[PDB]
């Protein structure tokens, strides 16, 4: 009778007797064996299972068309709040069926770190796409942090450990690479540079036009206004009043609306605090709240210029070789010169850094100008970060997966 | 009605027994841990996590000896055959299951320090903080970074203020302290007890006591004629280096020491204990003595003609004494210039010079009636401040206390 | 405050969970069994230890599943999977962990025999046990020995009085089997309910259905033209009665049915008996048999109570009754005097004297009719109502309050 | 790891700690327990399930004192105190530590009835059985039917060959217990012993030392001219009654054997225990001398000129001193008629009569020498089928072979 298992034993009974919720855990502890690998079950969860959403739907996607006969899995934590298109069958996190599910599967698929108490065996391909070309350094790379409940060495340790699991790991770019290989403790070896599934569509369908038009009309856009998507991060220093009523945003809509009005209709991808708290009263048909849009990569295609200050998605919008604006109002607060980023913000990003929303909205009367006026910045920074990108990488997985499945049916 | 608590206890009892885990003693004590096991006449001491027999709590229990013989006495070590204990009590190692009987059974906690929070204090038993020392480094609740492993600050904090709560009486040295602990550790002020320390009530009762002072002195083969400084600095994290094997011999140079006061001084040295196994006091005999393993401090303050420290609480215990004090501080630029991070104003109210080289300190060493003559107002209000309470009867308070507290129990 | 009880229900657990005993399910129920765990409209039944869907219990069911069908019906069954049940209910594993979730909750056990001691009983939950017939050898306390297995005869006693304890409304027969539980099972007559037995409803109400009579008959392949003859031993450590007689004398008027014990049953190689001895010892409803038969031969068994309601005749080979301790006192009523039929030890003559039934019901109507109004006065097939009734009155109080 | 055996006493011993048990020594007796705890010259004696010091161990340990008194001798008793052991042997009381780290320890077992189930007698040690007497009634085995209650007749076989089987030696006394044993012990021929009881051997060696036959007679202030006749009923459940408060005097009517013996003879009565405490021989001074709670049988037989008594092993160990028996058999109807409960022909082959009036018996033994005569020849041929294998060296025996093994244990 081994230690080892008399200590996941105990504290089953413990959990049993007791009547916590956990209990659906401890028995999965135990009971987790190589042999519930069916070496055809597949699953998927993105963002840690809040969404049928990024490059785990595309690989998904990918794999119904030409692999339609596996087990196909969905992890959610609202399962029946979450529409999945095909042969996939959903369950809800820290239930039965969701540890059912993990301990099945060949191959876990994901875009976001799957947590520590699931049991991956080395029978199992655990399959990382991540979420992004990074432009705050993370993980290892990062100095302090004073996250509550845990000291950095050990939320360091953790980390260390979820990437140590990752068999294959996504990237976008060289620099991701780079930055990976050792935030992620990882080796190169295990690194498939291939480019984002979720950003396929950005390379297949920027042209097909039926698709533009549906995006359109599901959102019930304007017809003769171009888009503007307005995409700022989250700030802690910006929540007050237990989020009730806000400050309106700096950008100041009364302003982008008497200036463009017109000529633009423009899109506010919140974080969803924010979304909550916004009035938009007033700009019916011109600023239209997009902050819940299941698809990002879908409210890109239709968007003729990004505005956006700190985030992993200029570096997704940037495939389209489209103009890109930068809004960092706060931009002082933000450690002077800052190294805490990767890249060099000040010296190679594709548009005018703005630190007042005025020269900007004067600046987005003429896009055409905008464009030439940056064509040579926008094109650098294409070749640097977008250049990896062939629209094949939701079929590079699925075959991957595929491959990968033949040989253990044997 | 299921015992949901008991459950939990029995389950980590049994994991422990079965994996041949060291704390099968601790669950087994923390199952049965009774109400009952109480014994009004039994009394648990032990100082500085079980390290010494020392400090407060041995005043206390050599006092009780003599007016109390007939109570049950149990003192608890890390290493009891290392630990010699005068008159009647018995000695428990640590984590051993006797030392959870002890603490099972007396009525009578009584220690210095932090003892441990998986030890269960009933509200049957009375526990005695004596604590260690009148604070001058900011402690506990009025820290601000605790980058201690394992831990963060505010998890530190939390379990501190655990064990204060368990806290029934604790002993304060002055006016100052009580500020400070009330907040510092989270207490009623009804629950201190000002009245000095059990251990400085050697500083008040026997400094002219020529016979004792001499015992002391040969106790450590001291040369006669030679009047004593004592030197006893905080331990330094930095000035740590290859293994501890050999330091840079002390900043205060005890070359030039000798070379200066040879002749008239005996200096004592009482160095942390990493320190004190890489000295190389070869070439300083008779004149530089160790004195790192010394059971008890407060005899050295007794034979001391000055102290030289920086800073430490030492400082508060030795001026009941009204002797010099030589504060030898010269790392003090890398302490944050102009500091607050002690509770008093380091800068001015100290008894005594700051000395940032050993150089003018070692000159002004030479004539001690000088210094004594010079600061001896700053000296006198250093006193009057942090001293006006010891009459050397703290050891007697609380053996009073905790007789009384018994008597009552036997009803 | 150290619950000492709980102490060692977990520790049994712990040892039960790690040795991987088959018991874990059971240590577990014990541990977690709390009097909170009980639904008002959860009722239990078990017949014969579980090894039927049989007798009173199963009456008392079918007959509170016509009436009050929305309450929560569970049967317990040595294997569920070999049983049918009509209706409604769900049937329960014996040990499986449905089981105990089951005792746990019911607010009732309805069952016929002695349910385990390991189940717990709450101050809370109603067990009502009908017991399986009117006595003829003594049992529970009134007896004098009982080497039997791995147990001494007190020990055997102190544990039946401890089930009998557990015994909240005990099913009596008749003042005779009343007098007689009172002293057997250690019971207060409060407590016992005289209105005879659920199982034998039919026995009363049904013993014209002609109808009915047809479709038992026909359930069971039986000659359109014969009589039919019951043969019901009782248990011991071919056959005595004689079959290759018994055919040449009656095979011309009568079938005869023989319901033996499994063990005894297929040992029987009834062949070129095939449309005169039927086996149907494993039959399910008895009930049903004594309805359609002419009349019965037995030996010293309580089925004679129950089939005397019919007040047909009864004939006792009692071949066996040199080597019962001759003049035999173990028998809490005189069984050479008074009962409704000849005694025979040689099964020779209990033959021709069988060849004509009617001689024999005259010749003792006066001592059937004697037996119907000591033992058989009492059972109103109106039993299954009662306790059905009971029941349902009982989950009222329980669900107000 | 944890090994299934392990953990089962594990869990019992964690149940008796915690539940202050008062078998908590057995349990961890249990845990830690191992073929390695021998030594082996310690030696363990017990007799009568530790009621006593007395028979075959007294005098197995006895010898070995005088000739081996080197090794650790130990005597198990249920109350060590109410016991006084001749010799160097340190005693101990049933299921205490000590108790335990006896049977642990022990490299031998000396033992006279059986020793309880949960002792574990190691591979590595020699449990010698000398039981304690040639069988009239059937044992173990042998026995029919057997109501006893808290065990059925099967359980009761089953646990005692368990115990039998334990047995390394098992000493006869005669062919005829050994035909029996090897049957109804479930015995191997070649563990048995005929040697003899050691406790007879005093029945041999000193029938005749009137030096001291004399020490016992005035241990018992018997009187000078008088000879000694003994009455040693077995129990019979028959007579007890009435909190055992008053008894009914005895069937042998001692008022008439007192008008008929008196002037000659004193009689020994031998009763049970609980007889004892409640026979009032008030006015038979001097007569009848209550002889019940004697700390040695042997010793008794030594003296006796004749000895009365039924069914009862005894006759066989009185017989190697070759006097007259009577059999005092009154209830012998009773007695299952013509049994076959016993072993040996009753109706013939003891060497005395059977009385069921006690009148004629009294007469009878008026004149022990026409009884020595008319029945000499009955005696002899008992002598010879039960008798004739006691050297008067049993002891010795059992002692050397004791030795002798712990020779070879010595490498
Ligand atoms: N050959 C038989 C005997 C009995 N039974 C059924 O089992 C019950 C018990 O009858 P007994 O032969 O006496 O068996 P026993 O368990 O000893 O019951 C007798 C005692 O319980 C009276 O209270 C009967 O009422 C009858 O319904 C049956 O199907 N077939
Ligand atoms: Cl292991
Ligand atoms: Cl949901
Ligand atoms: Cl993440
Ligand atoms: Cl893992
Ligand atoms: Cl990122
Ligand atoms: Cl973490
Ligand atoms: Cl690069
Ligand atoms: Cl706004
Ligand atoms: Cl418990
Ligand atoms: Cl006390
Ligand atoms: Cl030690
Ligand atoms: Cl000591
Ligand atoms: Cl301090
Ligand atoms: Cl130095
Ligand atoms: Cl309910
Ligand atoms: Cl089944
Ligand atoms: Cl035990
Ligand atoms: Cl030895
Ligand atoms: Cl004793
Ligand atoms: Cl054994
Ligand atoms: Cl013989």
Same mark, same amino acid.
């Given at each position: 009778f081994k230690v080892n298992q008399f200590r996941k034993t105990l504290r089953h009974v413990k959990n049993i007797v007791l009547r916590r919720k956990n209990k659906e855990r401890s028995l999965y502890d135990l009971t987790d064996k190589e042999d519930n690998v069916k070496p055809k079950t597949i699953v998927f969860e993105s963002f840690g299972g809040k969404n049928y959403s990024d490059s785990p739907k595309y690989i998904y996607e990918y794999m119904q068309k030409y692999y339609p006969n596996y087990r196909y899995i969905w992890s959610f934590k609202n399962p029946d709040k979450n529409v999945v298109p095909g042969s996939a069958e959903k369950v809800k996190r820290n239930s039965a069926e969701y540890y059912q599910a993990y301990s099945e599967a060949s191959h876990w698929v994901s875009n976001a770190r799957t947590p520590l108490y699931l049991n991956k065996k080395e029978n199992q391909t655990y399959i990382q796409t991540w979420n992004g070309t990074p432009l705050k350094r993370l993980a290892n790379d990062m100095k302090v942090v004073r996250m509550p409940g845990t000291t950095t060495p050990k939320y360091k340790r953790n980390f260390n450990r979820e990437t140590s699991r990752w068999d294959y790991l996504i990237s976008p770019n060289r620099y991701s690479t780079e930055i990976f290989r050792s935030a992620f403790w990882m080796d190169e070896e295990r690194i498939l540079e291939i480019g984002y599934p979720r950003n396929d569509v950005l390379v297949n369908r920027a042209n097909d036009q039926e698709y533009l038009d549906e995006i359109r009309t599901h959102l019930n856009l304007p017809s003769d206004k171009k888009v503007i998507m307005y995409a700022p991060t989250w700030r802690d220093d910006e929540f007050v009043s237990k989020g009730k009523y806000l400050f309106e945003?700096? *950008? $100041?809509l009364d302003n982008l609306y008497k200036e463009l009005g017109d000529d633009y209709v423009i899109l506010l991808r919140m974080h969803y605090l924010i979304s909550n708290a916004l009035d938009l009263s007033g700009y019916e048909n011109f600023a *239209? $709240? @997009?902050? #819940?849009? #299941?698809? @990002?990569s879908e409210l890109f295609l239709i968007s003729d210029c990004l505005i956006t200050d700190y985030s992993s998605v200029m570096f997704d919008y940037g495939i389209l070789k489209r103009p890109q604006f930068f809004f960092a109002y706060d931009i002082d607060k933000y450690d002077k010169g800052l190294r805490g980023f990767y890249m060099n913000y000040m010296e190679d990003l594709p548009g005018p850094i703005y630190t007042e929303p005025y020269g900007l909205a004067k600046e987005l009367k003429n896009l055409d100008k905008v464009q030439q006026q940056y064509q040579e910045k926008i094109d650098a920074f294409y070749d640097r970060f977008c250049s990896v990108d062939n629209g094949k990488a939701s079929q590079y997985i699925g075959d991957l997966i595929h491959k990968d499945i033949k040989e253990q049916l044997e």
């Open positions: 945003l700096k *950008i $100041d *239209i $709240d @997009v902050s #819940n849009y #299941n698809d @990002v």
